[PDB]
Design a protein around this ligand. Sequence first.
Ligand SMILES: Nc1ncnc2c1ncn2[C@@H]1O[C@H](COP(=O)(O)OP(=O)(O)O)[C@@H](O)[C@H]1O
Ligand SMILES: Nc1ncnc2c1ncn2[C@@H]1O[C@H](COP(=O)(O)OP(=O)(O)O)[C@@H](O)[C@H]1O
Ligand SMILES: [Cl-]
Ligand SMILES: [Cl-]
Lengths: 289, 289
Amino acid sequence: DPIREWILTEGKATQITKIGSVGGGCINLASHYQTDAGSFFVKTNRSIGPAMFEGEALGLEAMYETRTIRVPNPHKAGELPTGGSYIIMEFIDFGGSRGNQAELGRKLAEMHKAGKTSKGFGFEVDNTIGSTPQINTWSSDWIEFYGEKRLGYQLKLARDQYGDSAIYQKGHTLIQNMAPLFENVVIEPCLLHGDLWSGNIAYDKNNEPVILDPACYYGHNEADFGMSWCAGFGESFYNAYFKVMPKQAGYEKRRDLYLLYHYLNHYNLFGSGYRSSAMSIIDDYLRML
Amino acid sequence: DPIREWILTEGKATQITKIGSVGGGCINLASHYQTDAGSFFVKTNRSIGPAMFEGEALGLEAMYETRTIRVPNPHKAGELPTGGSYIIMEFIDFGGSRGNQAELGRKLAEMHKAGKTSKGFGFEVDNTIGSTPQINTWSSDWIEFYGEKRLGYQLKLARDQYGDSAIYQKGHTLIQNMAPLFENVVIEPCLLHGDLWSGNIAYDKNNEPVILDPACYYGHNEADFGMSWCAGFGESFYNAYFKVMPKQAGYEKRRDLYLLYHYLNHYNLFGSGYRSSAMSIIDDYLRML
Ligand SMILES: Nc1ncnc2c1ncn2[C@@H]1O[C@H](COP(=O)(O)OP(=O)(O)O)[C@@H](O)[C@H]1O
Ligand SMILES: Nc1ncnc2c1ncn2[C@@H]1O[C@H](COP(=O)(O)OP(=O)(O)O)[C@@H](O)[C@H]1O
Ligand SMILES: [Cl-]
Ligand SMILES: [Cl-]
């Protein structure tokens, strides 16, 4: 044990009293299947059970049916007999050299607008945002849904993983004083991609946008910008977006509220380096409110 | 085997001629060791040989010795007898309450200014950017080093993995016509972090910045902004940076050229969804020139 060896000689220690470990998961295997009937795209993971790929399949299916922005047609998700899970979907040839930021904003807004539900805010099944569970139980009030099943779940999860009771308490003050940020606007459920950043966006041979790896649910359309800090969205993206889905009162005031969910998720997934970003946002809203 | 089964049940195929696979690795295990002599931070990976962690340790050490921006003090890297590799470094308690942008820009500019070398552009050893090798052979001309050992290496790799001879040819056209972007300015070698985005930045108990997981070398200071599209650099970041470091002519013109290296690396690591960002930048420069 060279780690133990170094720590007990050179590190000047005589006993190791605790070891806490995170990480270590295995990444998906991504495969191109070549057959006499064309290509298929397959992703396998021997360590993870089938729930994650099933939620992806149902997310791709719901966005595919709006018939707006191009997504891979999903074919099958399930369990590997050897252990693990898989998904099979349409193979798409990426790499459109021009790209089209305005086309992405237009097509995304068409998906928000066309994707409708009579059941309120939520989704048919729970799925995941990264590896974190995403709770999707149907609710009729957006402020109720987002405060409890989005911010509230992530805060409670950080209190349990890190004993971070400070962010848990300040966060729940925010959740309780949140309503003025919504300025009495009426909020219609929209089919959201749910995890929209650079790694999930591509362009096909006609230079049309394609989006991948969803964490779908029906929510406030503005929540789909909550990963924008890793997206490179320009003014041509937003102006093409707002042409189809016009900008609502309080849009600028709420941008941080929707980033906050993903900053909490990154904290809970990737460590306390992200805690300052989340805490900074919570402090400003408490001041502003 | 449901994948082969489905491809011949509902996929309507009769022979699978090839299966091309990427991904599938396992991520690092990250460990907090508590001892009677204080804490240590340890990363292990049972799959990988020690070259990546050894490059990380020497990068930390170089940044540590400038005595400017805070980085974990590295202790030891090496190979696990069971197979794989490890690194041991200083444990730091993350979780700054507000977080501090201007201080990040100040401290980073000070590191560029203090970190010097008599050997030219490059580094003591080759290391890696992500998992991709980063060639650090000492050179005395920056235009030459960046064109060959950064852009050119990435273009060759892209040609070999994807048969993308178009990006390779347009790429080498740009490299050969590159000099006007530099407007004859003299370029001093600066110690660069080399992979500076949100996941590699953190804040300690005094809300001072800490940077992690380097891909270091001595280069043009402006190349350290090549990951800014996933960094969330505020205006207070750049205002504090340019207080320490004088901005050189052509700075705005060259920003995409340094993003391009990372777009190519992301293309090579995570797939052709990133090819459009790289090609768009190469196309604009060929026009502009
Ligand atoms: N020097 C350090 N001290 C304490 N914690 C650290 C240190 N470096 C990283 N961490 C923590 O370890 C975890 C993963 O580390 P990271 O730098 O992402 O390694 P990798 O790039 O191999 O995943 C995160 O929770 C992060 O906050
Ligand atoms: N439907 C698809 N058709 C063709 N290639 C795809 C498709 N979806 C993803 N890819 C490619 O597969 C690789 C991994 O895909 P990604 O969506 O990142 O999966 P994951 O995030 O589960 O690893 C990338 O190279 C990407 O270009
Ligand atoms: Cl990310
Ligand atoms: Cl990234």
